[PDB]
């Protein structure tokens, strides 16, 4: 048996649909389907089940598109909330036994209607060695790359509060204790709208 | 429901953890065992059986991972002479419903040494003036950093009470040196306010680390606090200027 999300992360704003990838091979005749979300507390919450000799299924907000014949069986999430932003898993269950993938992490992300993406230079905390910058008011599409040095620490875009009601923006943030670390060129091994705001 | 007991435990290496799958309110003559290991699948490990010997998949050895079904509500999974390569998320799973009743599952971290354990290093770093000047808006930044294992849980605290408006935090740690093996986490987290709030000296910004660490029956030599579970916190004051 063998389970295949070939996403490892997607980004879609709120309000929106989105579609999550799984393709398997199995032997078996008869078999299930099974979408997971694992919360951050690593627990694992029953989504839908699509039967091998059943029609595409539906349960609340989601729904499968079972393709037999390509052994496709793509979940859609539909009215997408901040809540949904978890990582998603597809099985396949012979006998009780389960197959999984690798799973996909799925960020819901704010409506941005005018984003200003920029990049500011925090003041030092008189408790830290550290340099932080901030890179922020990005569209949800924007791709944030890792570091390529050692000493340079960056993170992913982040995750909402799924309870946030106000001040709703993606950011990302890069740090290092190295005596040359400017916010200027921290995020360069990132594709960037032309118009990113560097204030001096 | 079932229940697996405990939901975290930090063991030294070559001690026999043992780790329980409780089924509650109904009675389980089945009971599957699977491990995660990070950003990885979950994967079959073993299947247990009343009144029969437990079914073990390819590739695990069944010196290294006692299974047991104990009665027809519990399953236990023993890692014998446990090892840091051992260290990972452990969840069970009994027949029933549409899906497999899961249990919470275990976080098994095995160390060398309980000297491994580190807490977060909690710092916060203050709204850019350019940032207030553009937006009108203002982002705190809360760095937790130098932590083992990668468990923690942050949250922010305005003027004493919990906030979620304005807070974005990083879907997972990051992993400090991704080459190494002992590498440690950092995990950072961002609170949006007004600019008008910010610039108030009367409000109080914290930002909360929760770390799940060692216990107060695990031994302790070393100069430094010894690494239990705690909240390590870093704050600010609001700036008129």
């Known amino acids: 048996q063998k389970v295949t999300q070939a996403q490892s992360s997607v980004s879609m704003p709120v309000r929106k649909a989105v579609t999550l990838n799984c393709l398997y091979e199995?032997?078996?005749?008869?078999?299930?389907i099974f979408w997971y979300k694992q919360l951050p507390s690593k627990e694992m919450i029953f989504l839908i089940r699509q039967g091998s000799d059943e029609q595409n299924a539906k349960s609340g907000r989601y729904s499968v598109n079972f393709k037999k014949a390509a052994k496709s069986v793509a979940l859609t999430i539909s009215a997408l909330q901040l809540e949904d932003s978890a990582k998603y898993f597809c099985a396949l269950g012979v006998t009780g036994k389960l197959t999984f993938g690798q799973g996909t992490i799925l960020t819901v992300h704010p409506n941005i209607q005018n984003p200003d993406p920029a990049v500011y230079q925090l003041r030092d905390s008189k408790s830290s060695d550290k340099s932080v910058c901030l890179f922020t008011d990005f569209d949800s599409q924007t791709n944030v790359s890792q570091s390529k040095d050692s000493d340079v620490y960056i993170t992913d875009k982040c995750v909402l509060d799924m309870r946030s009601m106000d001040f709703k923006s993606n950011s990302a943030v890069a740090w290092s204790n190295k005596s040359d670390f400017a916010c200027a060129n921290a995020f360069n091994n990132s594709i960037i709208p032309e118009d990113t705001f560097f204030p001096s | 429901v079932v229940s697996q007991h405990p939901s975290r435990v930090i063991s030294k290496s070559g001690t026999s953890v043992k780790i329980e799958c409780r089924s509650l309110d109904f009675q389980a003559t089945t009971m599957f065992w699977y491990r995660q290991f990070p950003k990885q699948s979950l994967m079959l490990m073993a299947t247990s059986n009343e009144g029969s010997k437990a079914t073990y998949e390819q590739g695990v050895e069944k010196d290294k991972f006692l299974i047991n079904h104990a009665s027809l509500t519990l399953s236990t999974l023993t890692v014998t002479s446990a090892h840091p390569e051992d260290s990972s998320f452990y969840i069970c799973?009994?027949?029933?419903?549409?899906?497999?009743?899961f249990g919470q599952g275990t976080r098994l971290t095995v160390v060398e040494d309980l000297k491994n354990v580190f807490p977060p290093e909690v710092a916060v770093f203050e709204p850019s003036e350019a940032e207030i000047s553009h937006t009108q808006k203002a982002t705190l930044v809360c760095l937790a950093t130098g932590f083992y294992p990668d468990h923690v849980e942050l949250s922010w605290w305005v003027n004493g009470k919990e906030v979620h408006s304005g807070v974005c935090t990083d879907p997972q740690p990051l992993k400090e040196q991704p080459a190494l093996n002992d590498s440690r986490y950092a995990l950072s987290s961002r609170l949006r306010v007004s600019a008008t709030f910010w610039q108030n000296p009367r409000n109080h910004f914290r930002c909360q680390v929760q770390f799940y660490g060692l216990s107060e029956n695990d031994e302790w030599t070393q100069d430094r606090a010894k690494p239990v579970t705690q909240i390590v916190s870093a704050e600010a004051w609001g700036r008129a200027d």
């Open positions: 199995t032997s078996w005749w008869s078999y299930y």
């Open positions: 799973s009994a027949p029933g419903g549409v899906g497999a009743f």
